Amino acid sequence: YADSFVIRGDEVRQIAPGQTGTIADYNYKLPDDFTGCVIAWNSNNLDSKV
Amino acid sequence: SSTASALGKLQDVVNQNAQALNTLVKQLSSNFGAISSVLNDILSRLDPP
């Protein structure tokens, strides 16, 4: 399973099992026993507009 | 009828059983190195992780 989206820079560490946050409980919550990997990388040059 | 302490054996059996049960129940209050001795407190004070 590959789930892709874009997030705020400071909330990147809410993407982890057993975490609490704004997006962590209202937008995307991971199971505690989740197995897999997470990939995070900046997109200032593309996903940001002047 | 008069002299007591003539039936020490049965009294000892009863006392041993009662004492063992009592200490087994007493063991609940211990901490075992956890935060507290009651599940509800540590459940309501901390998230599962």
From Swiss-Prot, chain B:
Protein name: Spike protein S2'
Portion of the full sequence shown: 939 to 987 of 1273
Coiled-coil residue windows: 11-49
Organism superkingdom: Viruses
Residue ranges of the region described as Heptad repeat 1: 1-32
Taxonomic classification: Viruses, Riboviria, Orthornavirae, Pisuviricota, Pisoniviricetes
Annotated organism of origin: Severe acute respiratory syndrome coronavirus 2
Record's function text: Subunit of the fusion protein that is processed upon entry into the host cell. Mediates fusion of the virion and cellular membranes by functioning as a class I viral fusion protein. Contains a viral fusion peptide that is unmasked after S2 cleavage. This cleavage can occur at the cell membrane by host TMPRSS2 or during endocytosis by host CSTL. In either case, this triggers an extensive and irreversible conformational change that leads to fusion of the viral envelope with the cellular cytoplasmic membrane, releasing viral genomic RNA into the host cell cytoplasm.
